[PDB]
Structures are given as C-alpha cells and as structure tokens.
Amino acid sequence: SLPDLKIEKLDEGVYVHTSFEEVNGWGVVPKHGLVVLVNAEAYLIDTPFTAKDTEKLVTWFVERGYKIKGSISSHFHSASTGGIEWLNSRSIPTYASELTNELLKKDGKVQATNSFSGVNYWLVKNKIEVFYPGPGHTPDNVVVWLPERKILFGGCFIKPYGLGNLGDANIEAWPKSAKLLKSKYGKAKLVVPSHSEVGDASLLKLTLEQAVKGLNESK
Ligand SMILES: [Zn+2]
C-alpha cells in the first residue's frame, strides 16, 4: 500500500500535490506537482501517476468550489502524464508540448488534447508560463513559471542532488539547458523539484553543477 495522495498549500493560490510510486531503489518515491488557482478555476501542473489519484486530486478541488480548467504535463513520463487519460475522459482540457505528445504517441500512451511549441508558451496569459530550456532529464522536459508569486515548478529537470535515471536523458545537452534555465529564472523565489523539498533559486545552480558533473563523469 502506497502512501495517500497529499495536497498542501505552498503559497497564495498555489498548492503542491504529492503522489507516490514504487520504484526499484528508493522503494516508494514521492512525486510533487502543483495546482494553481486563478479565479475560481484550477490548473493542474503535472498529473499524479494514476487515474485514481488524479480523480482524488480533481475532486478535492471540485468539492471546494473550483472548476478544473486544465492540466499541463512537464515531461512524458507517467510521473507527469499519468492522469491525462482520465482527465481526457472527463473532457477536462489537457496540455503537453509537441515533443511530449510525440514521445507519448511513440510510447503507445494517450496524448494531451492541446499541444504547443516554442521556447515559451503562456498557458494563462500573464499567470502560468511554460518554458523549454532544452533537453536534460528527457528530450521534452519543460518547466512552468508563475510570475506573480515568483514560483518555478521544475519537475524532474531540477536534480540538485544527483541526476537520477538517465534512461531518457541527454547528458551532453543538459548543462546548456540548465545554464539557460538559470539565466532565465534566477529571480525565482521558490523552485519546486519533482522528488525533493521546495528550495530557492540555488536549486538551479545545483542542477547545473550536477549536469556538468554528469557530462564530465560520462567521458
Ligand atoms: Zn521523468
């Protein structure tokens, strides 16, 4: 029995949702995503691994007066797209970049209903921006920046303590990508990694350092 889905308030209009999967090392590993409340509507930033937890997360907010306006998945792995099938099935708009949908399709997974490309994309005009620093953890990974609170959701592109699974990683490009991220969001007040506790802009530096170390230690 895996731990129960958790939903904790991180900042005004921002919640961190946490779900868990069983791996082959850390046994049970926590996966953090967010929920951004704009007006009386909620935007899911990454989905839980399963339909069960995505449903629990959706209903938690629906029962509090919030309509689910949509979800955005930061990379193709289930940790971020596990709930797209369920959300699609409820006609809740789901978003992913073209690269992500291509990896999903290729992996025989259901794709986001709405796609996008380019370095940056505003999911919600001046409130939720999606940024692509380039390949790192996976070919498609993106981050989501909330300008108002200065919060950066890094998903698993932010690896401040070690890079983890390199299976779909691009070790030679990760450094460049992390440099661009660090220059782009040095102003973040909070950086939310997928598997670790929340931190400040230092996580961008630390991620860069691990990426560099990883490239060096590869050749
Ligand atoms: Zn991943």
Swiss-Prot record:
GO terms for molecular function: beta-lactamase activity; zinc ion binding. It comes from the Bacteria. The keyword Ion transport does not apply. CDD domains: IMP_DIM-like_MBL-B1. Changing S194G: Reduces catalytic activity about 40-fold against imipenem, ampicillin and benzylpenicillin. Reduces catalytic activity about 10-fold against ceftazidime and cephaloridine. Binds 2 Zn(2+) ions per subunit. It catalyses: a beta-lactam + H2O = a substituted beta-amino acid. Belongs to the metallo-beta-lactamase superfamily. Class-B beta-lactamase family. Monomer. This is Metallo-beta-lactamase IMP-1. It comes from Serratia marcescens.
